[PDB]
Amino acid sequence: DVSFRLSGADPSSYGMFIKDLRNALPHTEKVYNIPLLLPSVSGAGRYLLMHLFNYDGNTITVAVDVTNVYIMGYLALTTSYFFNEPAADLASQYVFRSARRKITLPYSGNYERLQIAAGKPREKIPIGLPALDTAISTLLHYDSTAAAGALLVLIQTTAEAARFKYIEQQIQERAYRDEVPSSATISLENSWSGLSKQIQLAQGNNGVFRTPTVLVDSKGNRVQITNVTSNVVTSNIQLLLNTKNI
Numbered sequence: 204d205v206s207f208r209l210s211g212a213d214p215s216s217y218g219m220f221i222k223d224l225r226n227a228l229p230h231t232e233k234v235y236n237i238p239l240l241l242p243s244v245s246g247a248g249r250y251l252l253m254h255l256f257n258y259d260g261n262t263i264t265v266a267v268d269v270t271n272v273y274i275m276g277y278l279a280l281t282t283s284y285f286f287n288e289p290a291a292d293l294a295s296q297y298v299f300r301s302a303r304r305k306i307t308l309p310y311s312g313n314y315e316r317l318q319i320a321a322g323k324p325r326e327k328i329p330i331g332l333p334a335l336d337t338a339i340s341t342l343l344h345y346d347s348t349a350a351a352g353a354l355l356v357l358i359q360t361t362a363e364a365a366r367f368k369y370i371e372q373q374i375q376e377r378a379y380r381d382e383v384p385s386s387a388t389i390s391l392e393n394s395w396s397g398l399s400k401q402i403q404l405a406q407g408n409n410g411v412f413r414t415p416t417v418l419v420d421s422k423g424n425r426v427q428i429t430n431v432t433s434n435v436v437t438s439n440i441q442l443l444l445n446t447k448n449i
């Protein structure tokens with residue numbers, strides 16, 4: 204498992220958590236020096252448990268699919284909660300067996316749907332370590348509308364920071380003040396699968412993407428990523444979604 208405590212949290216211990224989370228995702232191979240997530244994993248080995256504690260020290264456990272870093276659901280005291288999607292239903296066979304009841308959220312895990320349930324797109328939802336404290340607090344008691352927003356916080360501050368060093372750094376910047384995600388943050392999250400695919404296809408195209416990926420950069424400007432020498436590939440991206448799952 205991996206754990207993260209908001210109590211006493213600073214950029215450094217959040218950095219330790221994101222490293223532990225990355226280290227808990229298995230791989231047999233690196234492609235341009237980036238771990239390649241597995242095509243699949245059978246049984247309960249497929250899910251990582253992240254124990255998250257808010258400032259007060261109350262806790263949820265979040266089940267994460269180790270092949271794609273998708274959050275599947277979570278446990279809050281004696282109740283499990285899963286996304287309304289077949290992968291999550293499948294996960295519910297293996298994790299949080301002991302929960303007194305299992306609630307299916309009234310939405311799937313994707314950003315479009317979640318932004319609809321929450322009432323705001325991501326661009327307008329502040330993230331940060333305080334927002335992550337809020338989200339834990341929210342998930343501890345069922346409220347599907349609130350939960351959508353809390354899940355949008357939780358996905359970005361865990362999975363998305365695991366995937367990209369830049370996003371991890373953005374969150375370290377808001378260790379004590381939330382702020383809506385930068386344009387680059389949103390662009391990177393939206394491009395992970397596209398990027399993961401092009402990096403893998405470059406492997407026999409001399410490092411050249413077959414299709415250039417458009418991103419917004421750290422300065423807010425619209426770049427074209429055409430090859431693996433780009434700093435998005437050399438510095439930023441930390442995990443690749445296997446093309447077998449694309």
Ligand SMILES: C[n+]1cn([C@@H]2O[C@H](COP(=O)(O)OP(=O)(O)OP(=O)(O)O)[C@@H](O)[C@H]2O)c2nc(N)[nH]c(=O)c21
Binds near residue numbers: 362392
């Ligand atoms: C298709 N899918 C993607 N995700 C992740 O859940 C979050 C929101 O879902 P998404 O499908 O909106 O992600 P996005 O458009 O960023 O796609 P990506 O570039 O391919 O990742 C993101 O972190 C996704 O990586 C998903 N998470 C869950 N629980 N279930 C899913 O089916 C699912």
Ligand SMILES: *[C@@H]1O[C@H](CO)[C@@H](O[C@@H]2O[C@H](CO)[C@@H](O)[C@H](O)[C@H]2NC(C)=O)[C@H](O)[C@H]1NC(C)=O
Binds near residue numbers: 430434
């Ligand atoms: C591949 O990698 C780098 C992207 O980082 C490209 O280098 C850029 O190339 C053009 C001129 O070729 C410049 O306008 C960019 O600003 C360069 N950037 C940097 C950081 O060096 C390179 O051109 C790409 N080439 C191909 C053929 O894919």
